[PDB]
Write a protein that binds this DNA or RNA. Structure first.
Ligand SMILES: [Mg+2]
Ligand SMILES: [Zn+2]
Lengths: 1316, 288, 66, 251, 54
DNA sequence: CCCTGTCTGGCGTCCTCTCACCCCTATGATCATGA
DNA sequence: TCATGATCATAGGCGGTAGCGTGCGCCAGACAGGG
């Protein structure tokens, strides 16, 4: 079955793979993150409650006072979104917090407080998010963009090759906390182990192991095994486990049990280890040279002298053995220090250590942190407990603790946010294990190590920084005042909190201005994974590897939509199905392929769970049950594609559209384009502009409805029902009774957004697309937006294209367009410019906006009214007067030189106290009248719905067929009816009606207050006049058009109609492209799009022929059914036998300008299907029609390719780039011309052009190019007199900026001069 | 990747093949970005080191120039003599091998007719005057530069050649990239250069030098093959002989450095004391 | 090398218009070094004719009248 | 500079000089009223560090800032590097009598001429038109001539066709790589708003027509017209200076 | 300003939250032990003037 | 004094176009209202 | 008439009784460490 707007124009759909998971709501990152941020969240985390429970309770400097936390609450905003964008306020909500003050007594902090006080306090204004997913900061709609950064936890990197120039790789182990001090363990080419804290000075690593109160005996107990030597009657025998001897060449003949096992000069084989462990050999015999370099573990003391025999971690010599042998020790514990197995890295590290106990280690750490000051044991304890071991200054998140347990092979993924002793010891153990040769290092670009922050987490962090500044103020004030006399709003002030959050949302590196000229550009700017910003890398520094697609971007981050230029691969865009995990990583759906059958359950995999399993490719053929029809199937195991068996697979992809993003899944035939041209096509499809009447794509991907409905430019119905009143302003839906609340009678009113300014100076319009009396369903479009049509997404328009060289006018990439295109007004885009004029406050008095103006006459002032402001509707030229303004000297606002327009909307804002002039009172009466009429129509329309409910209830149960309309309509309650649900319902509707009456009274009073009041404004401004010009820019030689595949081009000549190549029917082609761009720039998808567009228009022409002849609905039903079946096993399977002879005529009314065809991305329409659809129309099979010429009237040889391509106009127009300057203004500090176009400036004759004129022999051209034309002021006035008198001659002089160089060098101690 | 892309753009590409194509494409785009970033700075440093050199005289008055020979990597001759000695003033006057007969005088610009008359007589090495061996104080004379490139005649007195030179070197920096035996092909006389050779017992010619360079002199004088010959290599031929095509004339071992001798006699050990100077390591699984 | 060959000149304005300006101006400050405009880029700085094309004939005239 | 809001976001230099004068006046007052023995030392350290912030900020240990993270600009940051007087104001300058627009093809041109709009040719060539007006006697002063060419009356297009006729302009593509990147043409007036540029010539600019933008300059003086005709004309540079290959290869 | 306190056991960052803190008289990295010349041999002064500076 | 490692200074394309942003918080003084 | 409270206007450089910094990289030449 189909929805009623899907019976208007049902898009033909090729495609073979039956879908199982539809496209999710495309704005779920922004909305879900900010819903996670601001919501009443119990059990502590996440949200604002995490900040308010981690920075509170503020306890004082031992004054026994404490400011603890209760709850919070956000009130309603004073301004809704529309008034906020008009006036210019933030769209914020006040953050009320309930704080409590308690004050303890003397001698008992575990005793009773004498007095508490709990109260409401005001702090900050956090800006809310609109339903589109955007913020309104100062009247300009802004987006905060998700950041891709390093995951907190341990990270074992390897500084490969480059250091020490000898190939010896290093290994470092960066512990990355979420908030606190970093910690980098590393090696050096002497194979010592070095710690460092926050990239500061370097210490040997075991100095922190003493700082955790470990003795050296315990350290060697941890980081090494033991070797036991027993002195038993002969040559100091040894306990030997032969696994340590795997490949070691002994120094003697190892024999045991009267049997020679190992010979001198040979090594111990593995089978000799098997012999020694099979015979269970324990004690072997060593020479005196064997313990010549063995390292003792613990301290041995002589019992008689009380001295030290040998210190810990010391090699043993002959005299040390002679001392400890005669003291009474039979057991000797040493360490195993092999070449391959276990290096003595800990032992060499302890030999570099000068420290000896806990205190000296804490002193040295306190000295490397803060240099050159007296340490004290209390200060060293406090610093080292506040580096890693305090809840305040150090905090891994849950993400950090998960990565730190997972990368150390733990079990519990839950732990504390602070470190401990076992954590650092496990980091050093894993680092030594990586140095030993077992285990692997971790790459950086792997998406199991890249977390995604969003709006909620970054706003929480900035709010937390505001709170630690305010706890730095409350700790100041709390124990330095008289108690009890103050309340907790005199202490805490809202300036740092609001300053922090307002600086983050106002100007950050990630809170950026929304590129809004297209529904696609909105919905793909909100889905952006930027690597830049705070905590990430920078553009002009890094690098190589991060600008490259890793093998685990498959289905998380789009590989082909990224901006080319200085930041490729850093401004990644997130894919279609890609959600965000609980912790912040990326996850993507798959289908659990149990042992034979592809089960239709979806199952979200992260980036590290994907690697262990094995995933089938998306388009693998399966026969109606899930059984894979091949016995070799293409899969990918561990980041590496291969060919696997039938039933060793564990997952299949969901749909074939999931590698790409929503920018580059509206490209039909994407699998035929080379990836560079698909990148340029997706980026230019983002850069489109909305035309006047947007049409539709004939060749789409079916993804248009998700991008249109799941954005916020169309007016989606909330509750379905029957339309009651359509208008260009408003739309009224009457809600069906099986969707309807019992109370609040309810018929909905959609106030559309008519002609208003976007951010890119386009024209964001909404047009109603429903008829009257028409049913609508829940979840359905009512009003099309900009670049939409019937709920689809129509960016550009589809035109008749031919690929042929035509007389050179399409030489490199140019485009040649018939005048039939510009006559139909079909690229005529509508732009809106906002021109502001402020009435400031200066000396000699304030300014005047009135029209009594000097130096002007009738010809200027005829287009102004009697109070200076231009009319609404006056079509002005470039350089007239819009607002007349004179200062205590003409300073009237003028149209900037070049642009026409029609003044559509004038706003006047008045700072309160200033006299409103007559036009400001006219606008006040106008908006009073509009808001009065609008709220009165709200009351009338909802009262009409309420009375219709009363009529619907009184059909039964005491019905009065004639007596109902004899009495006035406001008394439909006291009629004959007992105590039932109906009199209860009439009482509830009377409650609703009296609520509407008193609500209408109070809301009309509040709206008169909002219109009548002034507005807070800039320091020293009287009134602001804003005027909206509405230019209509058509098309001309110089604009940029482009298709959807990377075929760019400046349109080069707008030919007449007659010159166009026509065919043997009569129709001229509209646009003549260039064929030579196809084999080099390998975008072969545009030719398949051209042929399938010609097939679509062939079906449309046959419908137009079968309908223009007034044929009955039977033949239309026949032909539309044949055009909708037409293919292989497909998904569509429609039938017109359930459309009932009236929808088929209206469906053919919508198909007569062409039949829309969906072609999904990697499961598209093959060549034979295009041929069979070109055979259904009577077009030629090869797609090529023979074409005549317009000039000569004789045939082009070798018939050419025509069809329809869907081409977009880009907003790089030519009357926004063109500029010229004879003599304008000059800069102030260096007397050179200004830069730019708005400032009337000159083009930079840069350095390489100076080199290119030195490279010729042009000497006078360069002399006037940098002395006369540019800098020397007396030289250029002499030049201007000489040019207007006909004498071409220059008096050179000196550049004045060289005198500026002399003054800047001379302002140092340097004495530069000019000799002779 | 060991499993290639068996699908072209006229047919489809499925998802993994298009993903691997994306690996290649984004690697290329990032190469072009950082490539431009280095290329512009290379042009800057070259036009700031040259910057000053102006053709300021008309004849320096020296003779010593550089020797232009066609470059020989060891295969086909890559850059011939016509494309190197095109338009540059000769250092010493070229005498054809009819010795004491002058072919060109010693200050003649070698334009295209003279280059064809060089190619006909198969002239070995036209010694020619270079900019680096000039004599003009504070500048470069006109005759040592050569033809005015981009024009036809000799260079005008004045055109700043440092700047056009530095732009001509740094301008194709956008196009650049960023990140056993001797087998003969042709036939001719055999030349050896910097060789110390001796006769083995087999009758061949063995070499006692690393600095040996083999050359193939053709029928008219020049050289079409050159080969760096290693130390102790064994030639199947000698100097001045004649070979045929496809004939490997030399063989050696790239793994072993041969310590071959000159005189024929017994071998004894001098200053070779066992245990210290030489050690006893018996090859276990072979025997020798 | 070309960056050291360009920083080691007898003319401090060329070596100042190239890389580090601090070291070049301090060395030329304590040495009392005296540029004489010597070629192309100093004359592009100071605003007069290049001694390359037509300005080469002008500079031969100017130097001949010295 | 005023920011038109009642306040002056000052330049960094006045901040630095203000800090030196504050610290110096406080040091004069502390040497006046006697320094507490081993005390007249911290203030001189502060003055030395403020002067070292003024002459070269950031060379001594951690630099200063006004707002917020960015270190502010001393004198050596005005002479050195990019954004300084050697590379931004003295070696490459902003230039009057110049303009820029988007290029296009127009193959009906001879190779020594390019299309150029009527609006750009009227705004580049203004004082030439003023001189021809008061030389032919169609405006008494300069102000009547300026208001005539602002109204664009029917006679100034004949003046403009009489001043374009034998007067070259310089076309320039924005990344000039080698010396063929600046060439000189003789303009032809075009109804439209783009620069029609001969196709063969676009082999030397490395310029396609997918949105490229080129800038035109005007040679004012007489010697510069002769240098843009004899030295830099588009018919003269047909050979590259890198080799002997022609640069007019048909593309 | 002259203040009497004791460095090590009472560490400074705890006391930082208050005034009296720009930093020690140093003439060097370490907080320099200052003389108390006024306290010891120069108690009572300011006969310079009461100029009330400027 | 003769290496050999560390440290801190230099440097990292051109041209153009668009947009926002460019103190708020605390203390003191004056005026008005209430007792 | 006096006192207290509230509102408005005018005036300066981590904010705090610490700690923030952490994702470039190469070359080069001086300063110093080890022997
Ligand atoms: Mg291009
Ligand atoms: Zn010479």
């Amino acid at each position: 079955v189909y929805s009623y707007t899907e019976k208007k124009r049902i898009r033909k759909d090729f495609g073979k793979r039956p879908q199982v998971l539809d496209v999710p709501y495309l704005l779920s990152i922004q909305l879900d993150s900010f819903q996670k941020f601001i919501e009443q969240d119990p059990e502590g985390q996440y949200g604002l409650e995490a900040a308010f429970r981690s920075v509170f309770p503020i306890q004082s400097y031992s004054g026994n006072s404490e400011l603890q936390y209760v709850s919070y609450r956000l009130g309603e905003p004073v301004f809704d979104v529309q008034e906020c964008q008009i006036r210019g306020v933030t769209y914020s909500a006040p953050l009320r917090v309930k704080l409590r003050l308690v004050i303890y007594e003397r001698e008992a902090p575990e005793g009773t407080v004498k007095d508490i006080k709990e109260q409401e306090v005001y702090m900050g204004e956090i800006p809310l998010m609109t339903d589109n997913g955007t913020f309104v900061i100062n009247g300009t709609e802004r987006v905060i963009v998700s950041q891709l950064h390093r995951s907190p936890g341990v990270f074992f990197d390897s500084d490969k090759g480059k250091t020490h120039s000898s190939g010896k790789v290093l290994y470092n182990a960066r512990i990355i906390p979420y908030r606190g001090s970093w910690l980098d363990f590393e090696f050096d080419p002497k194979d010592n182990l070095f710690v460092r804290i926050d990239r500061r000075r370097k210490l040997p690593a075991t100095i922190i192991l003493r700082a955790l109160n470990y003795t050296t005996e315990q350290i060697l107990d941890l980081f090494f095994e033991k070797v036991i030597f027993e002195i038993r009657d002969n040559k100091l025998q040894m306990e030997l486990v032969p696994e340590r001897l795997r490949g070691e060449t002994a120094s003697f003949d190892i024999e045991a049990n009267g049997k020679v096992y190992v010979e001198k000069g040979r090594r111990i084989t593995a089978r000799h280890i098997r012999q020694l462990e099979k015979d269970d050999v324990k004690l072997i015999e060593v020479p005196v040279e064997y313990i010549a370099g063995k390292v003792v573990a613990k301290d041995y003391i002589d019992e008689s002298t009380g001295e030290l025999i040998c210190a810990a971690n010391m090699e043993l010599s002959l005299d040390l053995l002679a001392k400890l042998s005669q003291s009474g020790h039979k057991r000797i514990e040493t360490l195993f220090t092999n070449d391959l197995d276990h290096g003595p890295y800990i032992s060499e590290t302890l030999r570099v250590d000068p420290t000896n106990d806990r205190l000296s280690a804490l002193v040295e750490i306190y000295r490397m942190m803060r240099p050159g000051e007296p340490p004290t044991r209390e200060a060293a304890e406090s610093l080292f407990e506040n580096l890693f071991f305090s809840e305040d200054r150090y905090d891994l998140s849950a993400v950090g603790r998960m990565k730190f347990n997972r990368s150390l092979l733990r079990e519990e993924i839950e732990g504390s946010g602070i470190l401990s002793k076992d954590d650092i010891i496990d980091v050093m153990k894993k680092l030594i294990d990586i140095r030993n040769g077992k285990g692997e290092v971790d790459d950086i670009d792997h998406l199991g190590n890249r977390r995604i922050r969003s709006v909620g987490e970054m706003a929480e962090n900035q709010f937390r920084v505001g709170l630690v500044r305010v706890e730095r103020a409350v700790k100041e004030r709390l124990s330095l005042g008289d108690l009890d006399t103050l309340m907790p709003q005199d202490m805490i002030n809202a300036k740092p909190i609001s300053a922090a959050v307002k600086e983050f949302f106002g100007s950050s590196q990630l809170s950026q201005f929304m590129d809004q000229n297209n529904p696609l550009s909105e919905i793909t700017h909100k889905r952006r994974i930027s690597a830049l910003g705070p905590g990430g890398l920078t553009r002009e520094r890094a690098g190589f590897e991060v600008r490259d697609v890793h093998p685990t971007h498959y289905g998380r981050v789009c590989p082909i939509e990224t901006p080319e230029g200085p930041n490729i691969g850093l401004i990644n865009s997130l894919s279609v199905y890609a959600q965000t995990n609980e912790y912040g990583f990326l996850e993507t759906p798959y289908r659990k392929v149990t042992d034979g059958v592809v089960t239709d359950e979806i199952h979200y995999l992260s980036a590290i769970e994907e690697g262990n399993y094995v995933i089938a490719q998306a388009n693998s053929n399966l026969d109606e049950e899930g059984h894979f029809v091949e016995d070799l199937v293409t899969c990918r195991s561990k980041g590496e594609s291969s060919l696997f068996s039938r039933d060793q697979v564990d997952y299949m992809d969901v749909s074939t559209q999931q590698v790409v993003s929503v920018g580059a899944s509206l490209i039909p035939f994407l699998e035929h384009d080379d990836a560079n041209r698909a990148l340029m096509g997706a980026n230019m499809q983002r850069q489109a502009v909305p035309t006047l009447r947007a049409d539709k794509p004939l060749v789409g991907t079916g993804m248009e409805r998700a991008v249109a409905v799941d954005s916020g430019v169309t007016a989606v119905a909330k509750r379905g029902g029957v339309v009651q009143y359509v208008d260009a302003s408003r739309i009224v839906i009457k809600v069906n009774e099986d969707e309807m609340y019992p109370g609040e009678a309810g018929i909905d009113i959609y106030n559309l957004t008519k002609y208003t300014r976007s951010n890119q100076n386009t024209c964001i319009n909404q047009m109603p697309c429903v008829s009257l009396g028409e049913p609508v369903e829940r979840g359905d479009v009512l009003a099309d937006g900009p670049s939409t049509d019937l709920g689809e997404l129509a960016l550009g328009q589809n035109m008749r294209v031919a690929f042929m060289p035509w007389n050179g006018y399409n030489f490199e990439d140019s485009i040649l367009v018939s005048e039939r295109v510009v006559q139909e007004d079909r690229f005529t885009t509508i732009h809106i410019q906002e021109l502001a004029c402020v009435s400031r406050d200066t000396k000699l008095g304030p300014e005047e906006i009135t029209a009594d103006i000097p130096n002007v006459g009738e010809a200027a002032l005829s287009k102004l009214d009697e109070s200076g402001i231009v009319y609404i509707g006056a079509e002005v030229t470039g350089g007239d007067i819009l607002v007349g303004k004179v200062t205590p000297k003409d300073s009237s606002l003028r149209v900037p030189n070049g642009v026409s327009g029609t003044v559509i909307d004038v706003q006047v804002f008045t700072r309160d106290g200033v006299e409103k002039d007559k036009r400001a009172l006219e606008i006040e009466e106008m908006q009073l009248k509009q808001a009065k009429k609008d709220l009165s129509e709200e009351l009338q329309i909802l009262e009409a719905g309420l009375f219709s409910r009363i009529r619907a209830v009184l059909v039964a149960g005491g019905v009065e067929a004639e007596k109902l309309d004899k009495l006035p309509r406001d008394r439909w309650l006291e009629l004959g009816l007992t105590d039932e649900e109906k009199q209860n319902q009439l009482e509830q509707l009377a409650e609703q009606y009296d609520e509407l009456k008193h609500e209408f009274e109070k809301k009309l009073e509040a709206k008169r207050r909002k219109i009548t009041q002034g507005d807070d404004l800039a320091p020293g401004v009287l009134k602001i006049v804003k005027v909206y010009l509405a230019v209509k820019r058509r098309i001309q030689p110089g604009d940029k058009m482009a298709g959807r595949h990377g075929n760019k081009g400046v349109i080069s000549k707008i030919n007449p109609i007659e010159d166009m190549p026509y065919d043997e029917n009569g129709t001229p082609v509209d646009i003549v492209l260039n064929p030579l761009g196809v084999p080099s720039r390998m975008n072969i998808g545009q030719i398949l799009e051209t042929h399938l567009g010609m097939a679509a228009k062939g079906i449309g022409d046959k419908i137009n022929a079968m309908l223009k002849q007034q044929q009955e609905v039977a033949k239309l039903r026949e032909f539309i059914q044949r055009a909708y079946d037409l293919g292989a096993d497909v998904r569509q399977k429609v039938d017109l036998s359930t459309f009932s002879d009236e929808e088929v005529m209206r469906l053919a009314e919508n198909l007569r300008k062409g039949m829309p065809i969906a072609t999904p991305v990697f499961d598209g329409a093959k060549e034979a299907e295009i041929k069979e659809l070109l055979k259904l129309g009577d077009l030629p099979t090869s797609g090529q029609i023979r074409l005549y010429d317009g000039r000569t009237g004789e045939q082009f040889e070798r018939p050419v390719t025509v069809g329809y391509m869907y081409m977009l106009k880009l907003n790089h127009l030519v009357d926004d780039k063109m500029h010229a300057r004879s003599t304008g203004s000059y800069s102030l500090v260096t007397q050179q011309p200004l830069g730019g176009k708005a400032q009337f400036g000159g083009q930079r004759f840069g350095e390489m052009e100076v080199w290119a004129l030195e490279a010729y022999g042009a000497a006078y051209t360069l002399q006037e190019m940098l002395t006369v034309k540019s800098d020397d002021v007396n030289g250029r006035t002499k030049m201007y007199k000489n040019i207007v008198d006909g004498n071409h001659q220059m008096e050179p002089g000196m550049p004045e900026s060289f005198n500026v160089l002399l003054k800047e060098i001379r302002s140092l101690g340097i004495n530069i001069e000019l000799e002779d | 990747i060991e499993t290639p892309i068996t699908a072209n753009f006229r047919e489809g590409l499925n998802v993994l093949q298009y993903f691997i194509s994306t690996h290649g494409a984004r690697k290329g785009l990032a190469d072009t970005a950082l490539k431009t970033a280095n290329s512009g700075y290379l042009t800057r440093r070259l036009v700031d080191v040259a910057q000053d050199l102006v053709v300021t005289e008309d004849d320096c008055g020296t003779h010593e120039g550089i020797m232009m020979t066609p470059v020989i990597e060891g295969g086909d001759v890559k850059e011939p003599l016509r494309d190197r000695v095109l338009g540059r003033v000769t250092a010493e006057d070229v005498l054809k091998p009819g010795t004491a007969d002058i072919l060109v005088p010693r200050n003649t610009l070698l334009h295209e007719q003279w280059c064809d008359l060089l190619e006909e007589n198969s002239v070995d090495a036209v010694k020619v005057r270079s900019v680096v061996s000039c004599d003009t104080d504070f500048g470069v004379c006109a005759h040592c530069y050569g033809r005015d490139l981009a024009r036809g005649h000799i260079i005008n007195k004045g055109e700043a050649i440092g700047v056009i030179a530095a732009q001509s070197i740094g301008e194709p920096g956008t196009q650049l990239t960023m990140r056993s035996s001797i087998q003969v092909k042709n036939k001719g006389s055999i030349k050896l250069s910097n060789v110390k050779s001796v006769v083995n017992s087999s009758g061949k010619l063995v070499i006692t030098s690393r600095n040996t360079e083999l050359k193939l002199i053709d029928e008219f004088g020049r050289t079409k093959e050159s080969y760096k010959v290693p130390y102790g290599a064994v030639l199947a031929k000698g100097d001045g002989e004649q070979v045929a095509g496809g004939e490997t004339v030399a063989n050696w071992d790239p793994h072993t450095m041969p310590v071959i001798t000159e005189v024929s006699g017994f071998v004894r050990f001098t200053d070779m004391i066992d245990g210290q100077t030489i050690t006893r390591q018996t090859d276990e699984l072979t025997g020798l | 090398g070309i960056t050291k060959a360009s920083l080691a000149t007898e003319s401090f304005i060329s070596a100042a218009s190239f890389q580090e300006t601090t070291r070049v101006l301090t060395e030329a400050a304590v040495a009392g070094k005296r540029d004489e405009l010597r070629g192309l880029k100093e004359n592009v700085i100071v605003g007069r004719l290049i001694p390359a094309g037509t300005g080469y004939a002008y500079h031969q005239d100017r130097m001949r009248r010295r | 500079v005023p920011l038109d809001g009642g306040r002056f976001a000052t330049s960094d230099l006045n901040d630095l000089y203000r800090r030196v004068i504050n610290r110096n006046n406080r040091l004069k007052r502390l040497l006046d009223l006697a320094a507490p023995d081993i005390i007249v030392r911290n203030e001189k350290r502060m003055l030395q560090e403020a002067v070292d912030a003024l002459l070269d900020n950031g060379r001594r240990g951690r630099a200063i800032t006004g707002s917020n993270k960015r270190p502010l600009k001393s004198l050596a940051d005005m002479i050195k590097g990019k954004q300084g007087r050697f590379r931004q104001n003295l070696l490459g300058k902003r230039v009057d009598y110049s303009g820029r627009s988007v290029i296009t093809v127009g193959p009906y041109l001879r190779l020594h001429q390019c299309g150029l709009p009527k609006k750009m040719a009227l705004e580049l060539f203004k004082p030439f038109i003023y001189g021809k007006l008061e030389l032919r006697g169609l405006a008494t002063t300069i102000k009547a001539a300026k208001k005539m060419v602002e109204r664009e009356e029917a006679v100034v297009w004949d003046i403009l066709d009489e001043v374009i006729r034998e007067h070259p302009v310089l076309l320039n593509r924005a990344p000039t790589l080698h010396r063929l990147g600046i060439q000189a043409f003789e303009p032809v007036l075009i109804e439209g708003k783009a620069i029609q540029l001969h196709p063969l010539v676009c082999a030397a600019y490395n310029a396609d027509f997918d949105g490229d933008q080129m800038a035109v300059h005007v040679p004012l003086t007489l010697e510069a017209q002769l240098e843009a005709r004899a030295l830099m004309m588009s018919t003269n540079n047909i050979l590259s200076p890198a080799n002997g290959e022609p640069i007019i290869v048909p593309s | 300003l002259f203040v009497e306190f004791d460095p090590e056991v009472i560490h400074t960052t705890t006391i930082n939250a208050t005034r009296g803190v720009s930093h020690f008289v140093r003439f060097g990295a370490s907080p320099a032990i200052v003389p108390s010349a006024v306290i010891h041999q120069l108690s009572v002064y300011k006969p310079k003037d009461i100029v009330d500076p400027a």
